[PDB]
Design a protein around this ligand. Structure first.
Ligand SMILES: OC[C@H]1O[C@H](O[C@H]2[C@H](O)[C@@H](O)[C@H](O)O[C@@H]2CO)[C@H](O)[C@@H](O)[C@@H]1O
Length: 184
């Protein structure tokens, strides 16, 4: 299936609905008024590396002073890819904001430091392939029992607060995913 038709779930964290240049609908945040805190602080800033018509995805965020996450229903078995979108709109040195990302307890991104990877006010994406079959979730060479729900959590450590800007899940494999442009 083509790109829009292969997307099963998508969220603009801290924000309203937005359709991107590929035709992907990022839904308004389902955690509005629940756990965590929405912030539109980045709406004053140009976001480098991103396509300019889609900067609003990176200018809005959900963050928290304690661990938080999204629960996702997955209705059918198959191959999927999770894409997570981030920007650092406050700090401009390394080892200021650092956090882990977990999927059903598996650590899938260890010690993410957005500024160290891309700089200030610049797009950074993590691309995480997974498979659901025979009653199991498989991700990064690890395996556990799958019950129908995926729990995506952003873990509070010692260096400032975990955050996310947007996220989506598509059916397919890694070669099917649009990539950000190479960046210094
Ligand atoms: O909404 C802007 C940012 O707010 C928080 O950053 C805090 C930071 O944790 C604190 O140490 C400092 O004194 O103030 C800033 C701004 O309130 C979030 O942690 C960031 O992710 C947000 O971008």
């Amino acid at each position: 299936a083509g790109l829009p038709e292969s997307v099963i779930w998508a969220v603009n964290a801290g924000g309203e609905a937005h359709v991107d240049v590929h035709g992907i609908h990022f839904r308004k945040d389902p955690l509005e008024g629940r756990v965590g805190r929405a912030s539109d602080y980045g709406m004053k800033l140009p976001i480098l590396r991103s396509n300019p018509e889609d900067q609003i995805l990176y200018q809005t965020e959900r963050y928290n002073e304690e661990t938080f996450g999204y629960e996702v229903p997955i209705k059918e078995e198959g191959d999927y890819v999770l894409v997570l979108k981030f920007a650092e709109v406050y700090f401009a040195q390394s080892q200021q904001k650092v956090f882990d990302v977990r999927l059903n307890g598996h650590v899938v991104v260890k010690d993410l430091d957005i500024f160290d990877r891309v700089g200030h006010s610049t797009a950074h994406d993590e691309i995480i392939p997974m498979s659901i079959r025979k009653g199991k979730l498989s991700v990064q060479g690890e395996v556990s029992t799958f019950t129908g729900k995926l729990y995506i959590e952003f873990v509070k450590g010692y260096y400032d607060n975990p955050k996310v800007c947007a996220l989506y899940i598509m059916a397919g494999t890694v070669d099917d995913v649009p990539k950000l442009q190479p960046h210094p």
